[PDB]
């Protein structure tokens, strides 16, 4: 018997952006209040967690564009 | 018997951005209040965690563009 | 029997940015208040953790562009 | 002619209070936001004024009792 | 002619208070935000004023009792 | 003609307080933010004023009791 495999995807695409001025942006939060209460935690495996935050962000990229791409190949008898 | 594999993906893409001035950006939080209470923690394996934060960010990149790409190949009898 | 493998991905892509002035950026937080309370911690394996923060950031790169890329190959009888 | 006046009010009253413990009192405001806008002010005579406040109070007297009392007398030809 | 005046008010009153423990009192404001805008001010006579405050108080007297009392007398031909 | 005046008010009153322990009192403000803007001020006569405050107080007297009392007398032809 015989087996042959060719895996040759060709990627030629683009992700692009154009802009003038981003200009006046304001973020003026009047601070709230947070309370959290707990007895025991057991984050045993691959947990991602966040507790009692009160958290502010101003993410303002000039681009902010993104590409994600994944390839796989598997073989058995 | 025989086996042959060729793994030759060709990547030619782009991620790009263009901008004028990013200019006036403001972030003026009036500070809140956070309280968190707990008895025991047991973060046994690969945990990522954050507790009682009260946290402010102004992330302003001129680009901020991103690409992610992953390849794999596996073999058995 | 025989086995042959060729692993030759060709990467030719780009991640790029262009900008004028980034200019006026302000971050003027009115400081909040944080309290956190706990009895025991047991961060046994590969934990990443942060408690009672009250933390401010102004990350302003001229670029900020990123690429991530990973390759693998595996073999057995 | 003749005139005679006697002004002799007799005040014997009381204002009084009795209490146990005043105990658990909480005041935990999540801070709001106030904006006020104006062009000209002309507070010419005996004005009492307050603008753009955002103001918190916890007045907790053990007594807090009050008395007010006023007397007058007037004469003419 | 003749005129006679007697002004002899007799004040014998009391203002009083009694208390146990005043105990647990909390005041934990999550700080708000205030903005005020104006062009001209002209507080010409006996003005009392307050602008753009953001102000916190915990007045906790053991007494806090008050008395106010005023007397007057006037005469003419 | 003749005029006679007697002004003899007799004041015998009291203002009083009694207390146990004043005990646990807390004041933990999460700091707000204040902005005030103006062009001209003209506080010409007997003005009392306060601008752009952001101000915290914990007034805790053991007494705090008060008395105010005023007397007057006037005469003419």
Residue numbers in the entry:
A (entry chain G), B (entry chain E), C (entry chain C), D (entry chain H), E (entry chain F), F (entry chain D): 304 to 380
What's the publication's text?
Tau amyloid fibrils have previously been established to adopt many distinct conformations across different neurodegenerative conditions. High-resolution structures revealed paired helical filament (PHF) and straight filament (SF) conformations of tau that were identical to those determined from AD cases. The PHFs and SFs are made of two C-shaped protofilaments, each containing a cross-β/β-helix motif. Overall, these results establish that, despite substantial differences in genetic background and age, tau filaments that arise in individuals with DS and neurodegeneration are identical to those in AD.
To overcome the low level of tau filaments obtained from the 36-year-old case, we used a custom-developed graphene oxide (GO) affinity-grid method in which the cryo-EM sample grids were derivatized with anti-tau antibodies to capture and enrich for tau filaments prior to vitrification. For this procedure, single-layer GO was applied to QUANTIFOIL grids, functionalized with a PEG maleimide, and coupled to protein G for binding to the AT8 phospho-tau (S202 and T205) antibody. This GO-AT8 affinity-grid method was tested initially for capturing tau filaments purified from case 2 samples, which exhibited robust NFTs. Conversely, when AT8 was included in the grid preparation, we observed extensive tau filaments in cryo-EM images, although some background contaminants remained. Together, these data indicate our GO-AT8 affinity-grid method successfully enriched for tau filaments in an AT8-dependent manner. Next, cryo-EM datasets were collected for tau filaments isolated from DS cases 2 to 4, with GO-AT8 affinity grids being used for cases 2 and 4. The resulting cryo-EM reconstructions showed all cases contained predominantly AD PHF conformations, while cases 2 and 3 also exhibited substantial SFs, similar to case 1. However, molecular models for cases 2 and 4 confirmed PHF and SF conformations were resolved using the GO-AT8 grids. Notably, structure determination for case 4 remained limited by the low abundance of isolated filaments, resulting in a final resolution of 5 Å for the case 4 PHF. Nonetheless, our structure determined to 5.0-Å resolution was sufficient to establish the AD PHF fold.
